[PDB]
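Rotation project, supervised by the postdoc (A.L.). Task for the rotation student: set up a whole-complex structure prediction and record inputs and outputs verbatim in this book. Inputs entered:
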Amino acid sequence: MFRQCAKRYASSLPPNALKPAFGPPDKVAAQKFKESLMATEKHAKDTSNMWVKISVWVALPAIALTAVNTYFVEKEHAEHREHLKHVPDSEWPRDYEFMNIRSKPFFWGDGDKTLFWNPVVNRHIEHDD
Amino acid sequence: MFRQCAKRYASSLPPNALKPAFGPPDKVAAQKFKESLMATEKHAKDTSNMWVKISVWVALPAIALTAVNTYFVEKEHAEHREHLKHVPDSEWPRDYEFMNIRSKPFFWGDGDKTLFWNPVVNRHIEHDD
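Outputs recorded:
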């Protein structure tokens, strides 16, 4: 019976459960910017895989130097002598066999046919196995 | 006279969709920049400069071993001093012929006489067949 004790000018019905807002905001560029991003996909490809992959890149030209440095380290020792002496000729395994054909180059020599009886034994005549 | 009214219909609705409006050049370039200056400042990054910057970081450790290698080879003659007599003869092109001409200056030398029997091959030619 008693409702609204004031005379209105136009029929209306303000909000009660929902607020339609009676004032258009100002910040509208913040939406069109974030909205364009959503659909527009920029993230792609694996950047982490390519990043670490660079390691091997510089690791190739780098080791190339360190690799040669090693040989240079023992270069001083190599030139030096400690074991494996090289003086006599008998030590040479090739010599013996080479001595055979050596009979031609020199041609002249002492005891060629007689000395030949030595190597001929190394040949060893086989029959079957 | 006049009879222009603003609100006549008792049922209005905000235009959901609008119509296109073409015309003269709008130029979105000058606006793209003016928009950034509006609130935010100019700003200027330089992450790319980090690529060359790191170059020095890795250039320190690398050159470290490189520098040490410089003295390493120098230690060669250092440790093994006293070297009046040469060695490489076939390597150095000059050496070979040099040993021949040196036969005079030296005058007296042991081992050069017999060895001289080899270089002579170059002096005289050999015609076979």
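Student's summary: The CA atoms of residues 51 and 57 of chain B lie 10 Å apart.
Supervisor addendum: Residues 50-123 of chain B form one domain.
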